[PDB]
Scaffold this active site. Structure first.
Site, PDB file in Angstrom:
ATOM      1  N   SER A 105      50.815   7.545  39.468  1.00 14.28           N
ATOM      2  CA  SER A 105      49.676   7.736  38.556  1.00 14.28           C
ATOM      3  C   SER A 105      49.487   9.201  38.136  1.00 14.28           C
ATOM      4  O   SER A 105      50.388   9.801  37.497  1.00 14.28           O
ATOM      5  CB  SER A 105      48.479   7.192  39.248  1.00 14.28           C
ATOM      6  OG  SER A 105      47.403   7.256  38.368  1.00 14.28           O
ATOM      7  N   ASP A 187      50.533  -2.744  33.017  1.00 19.11           N
ATOM      8  CA  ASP A 187      49.710  -1.780  33.783  1.00 19.11           C
ATOM      9  C   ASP A 187      48.246  -2.008  33.368  1.00 19.11           C
ATOM     10  O   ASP A 187      47.976  -1.950  32.195  1.00 19.11           O
ATOM     11  CB  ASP A 187      50.293  -0.369  33.649  1.00 19.11           C
ATOM     12  CG  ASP A 187      49.759   0.630  34.655  1.00 19.11           C
ATOM     13  OD1 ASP A 187      48.555   0.489  34.985  1.00 19.11           O
ATOM     14  OD2 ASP A 187      50.569   1.575  35.081  1.00 19.11           O
ATOM     15  N   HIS A 224      49.940  -1.647  38.157  1.00 18.53           N
ATOM     16  CA  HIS A 224      49.839  -0.200  38.430  1.00 18.53           C
ATOM     17  C   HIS A 224      50.461   0.158  39.783  1.00 18.53           C
ATOM     18  O   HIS A 224      51.136   1.203  39.833  1.00 18.53           O
ATOM     19  CB  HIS A 224      48.389   0.295  38.282  1.00 18.53           C
ATOM     20  CG  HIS A 224      48.329   1.785  38.286  1.00 18.53           C
ATOM     21  ND1 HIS A 224      49.054   2.549  37.404  1.00 18.53           N
ATOM     22  CD2 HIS A 224      47.698   2.648  39.108  1.00 18.53           C
ATOM     23  CE1 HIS A 224      48.878   3.826  37.693  1.00 18.53           C
ATOM     24  NE2 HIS A 224      48.045   3.906  38.728  1.00 18.53           N
TER      25      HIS A 224
END
EC number: 3.1.1.3
Length: 317
Positions: A105, A187, A224
């Site tokens: 991330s 995502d 994610h």
């Protein structure tokens, strides 16, 4: 690209050093370190204990990680100082040898912000393996900014933030070191990501932009956390880390690697923890800091985001 002196750290070197830990070694004497840069709402360990800490171990790296306080929710610019200090230290600590950086991330944003704004660490990174990085930030932060309930770093990862404007305008959506970018259409944290084009948040110019659905089909779903922890992500990470080029090679993987479940070289217990990777970060977000505006840019980034609004007001230099 900026090419002057590095910016000043706003943190004391001792604070920065304290956020840097290495498995079984001190940064000042370590063999083959890899630096792991965590995602929003987590510590180095909370990101990588269930995945790249053991995975990098088995590929013959000494995993090291920063844990910028608190849980990567503060100013990405200060979370970046922890990463710059760690690269300086680990380069010197390993016999002046270039090290890989692997990231989840925001860890990606932080990484690319480092290489954009602190020129002295470009000669120290041989490669960057960003898992679901948000270089454009994300549009799905918009509702929470509208509520004015957002951590410093969640403002800064909003699409159109001063921080993401500053990065782009300083030439930061182009790779600065050989860079692979594993990411997913599906995502649910980072969008936009569906185009398999430079439109995607995870996309750099000259980078090995691997959208998962570009290899495995449009009927493929990793989320994610999946983008960091999956067998597919192992194989792509393995590929980039071994590549003489610094980038994943399509030659190294195929359709049979399209496995969204946690890496098979993790123990059953590791798989179970990696499956639930995001809940910590979701919780640390609801537990964490909250303000009504995006943190000010520090002077070095301000010339690249003129017109934008931060806490002090509109950026002028």
């Amino acid at each position: 690209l900026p090419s002057g002196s590095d910016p000043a750290f706003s943190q004391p070197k001792s604070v920065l050093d304290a956020g840097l830990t290495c498995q079984g070694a001190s940064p000042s004497s370590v063999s083959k370190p890899i630096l792991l840069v965590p995602g929003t709402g987590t510590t180095g360990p909370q990101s990588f204990d269930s995945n790249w800490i053991p995975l990098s171990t088995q590929l013959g790296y000494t995993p090291c990680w920063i844990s910028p306080p608190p849980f990567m929710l503060n100013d990405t610019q200060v979370n970046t100082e922890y990463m710059v200090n760690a690269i300086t230290a680990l380069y010197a600590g390993s016999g002046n040898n270039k090290l890989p950086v692997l990231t989840w991330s925001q860890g990606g944003l932080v990484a690319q912000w480092g290489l954009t704004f602190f020129p002295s660490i470009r000669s120290k990174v041989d490669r960057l393996m960003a898992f679901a990085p948000d270089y454009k930030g994300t549009v799905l932060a918009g509702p929470l900014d509208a509520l004015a309930v957002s951590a410093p770093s969640v403002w800064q990862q909003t699409t159109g933030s001063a921080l993401t404007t500053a990065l782009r305008n300083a030439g930061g959506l182009t790779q600065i070191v050989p860079t692979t970018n594993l990411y997913s259409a599906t995502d649910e944290i980072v969008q936009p990501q569906v185009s398999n084009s430079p439109l995607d948040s995870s996309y750099l110019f000259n980078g090995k932009n691997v959208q998962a659905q570009a290899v495995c089909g449009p009927l493929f779903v990793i989320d994610h956390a999946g983008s960091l922890t999956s067998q597919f992500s192992y194989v792509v990470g393995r590929s980039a880390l071994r590549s003489t080029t610094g980038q994943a090679r399509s030659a190294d993987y195929g359709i049979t690697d399209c496995n969204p479940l946690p890496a098979n070289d993790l123990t059953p217990e590791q798989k179970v923890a990696a499956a639930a990777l995001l809940a910590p970060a979701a919780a640390a977000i609801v537990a964490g800091p909250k303000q009504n505006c995006e943190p000010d840019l520090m002077p070095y980034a301000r010339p690249f985001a003129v017109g934008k609004r931060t806490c002090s007001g509109i950026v002028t230099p």
